Amino acid sequence: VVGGTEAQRNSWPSQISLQYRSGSSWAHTCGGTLIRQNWVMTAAHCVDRELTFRVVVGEHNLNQNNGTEQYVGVQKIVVHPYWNTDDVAAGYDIALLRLAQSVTLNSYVQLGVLPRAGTILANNSPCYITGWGLTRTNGQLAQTLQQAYLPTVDYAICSSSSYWGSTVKNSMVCAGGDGVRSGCQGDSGGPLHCLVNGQYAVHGVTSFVSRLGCNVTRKPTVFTRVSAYISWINNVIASN
């Protein structure tokens, strides 16, 4: 997250760190949202590789034991059937991971709330992106969970030619593009939290940014619109 602030230790209890086994060590690779005690929602491009994965819940500082964390192996990986590894602009950038075990909920570990199927946010809805991503274009991963205020850019606007034109699909959500705040490498697969009628829900899955940089004026961060996959989500979980 470029231009954010460190989040309060209990601000986003559904935020997970997806990590891969790197030699003997583990490497933070992407964000995710805890949606069930044994299920996690992420980006397809994060788990579409032959790596050994784990999830960390109640994570705050990636380099220190806070004492609030739980480590869990990944039992099942379910990638959207229409996902094309090559084409992130085609959409369907979403995957569900079945945890090896069910987590214990507490002050720091809580389920993420998804939107009612089809929910569309008006232009400029108040959202927050969270993640351990680069804090600057070509910078270093944050150590502590960061958060930045990133409001919606409705489709009509986002898909206009001064924005993302034909790149952005109606199955995606754009937020930010002020040239100051944005998601950046290592934020992928994490939530976009929006406040709608006094309630927060997870409306986005961080997907992609511009090739010219993370925070580029009129190049908002693009997320997979969760509300478009509720039935897919619903069937996977019900049957896996």
Binding site: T29, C46, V88, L141, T167, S188, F208, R211
Partner: protein
């Protein structure tokens, strides 16, 4: 290595070290172009 050009791709997945599906144009069939995709290297039809 390759007769033609790779397409410009202006979106990047917001992940570090994305998986490569080729390294050389030769890892690609026919009008084999190993190029920088939206999330790692992939095989494009040139220009």
């Amino acid at each position: 290595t390759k007769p033609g050009s790779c397409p410009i791709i202006l979106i990047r997945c917001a992940m570090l070290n994305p998986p490569n599906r080729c390294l050389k144009d030769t890892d690609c069939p026919g009008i084999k172009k190993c190029c920088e995709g939206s999330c790692g290297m992939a095989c494009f039809v040139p220009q």
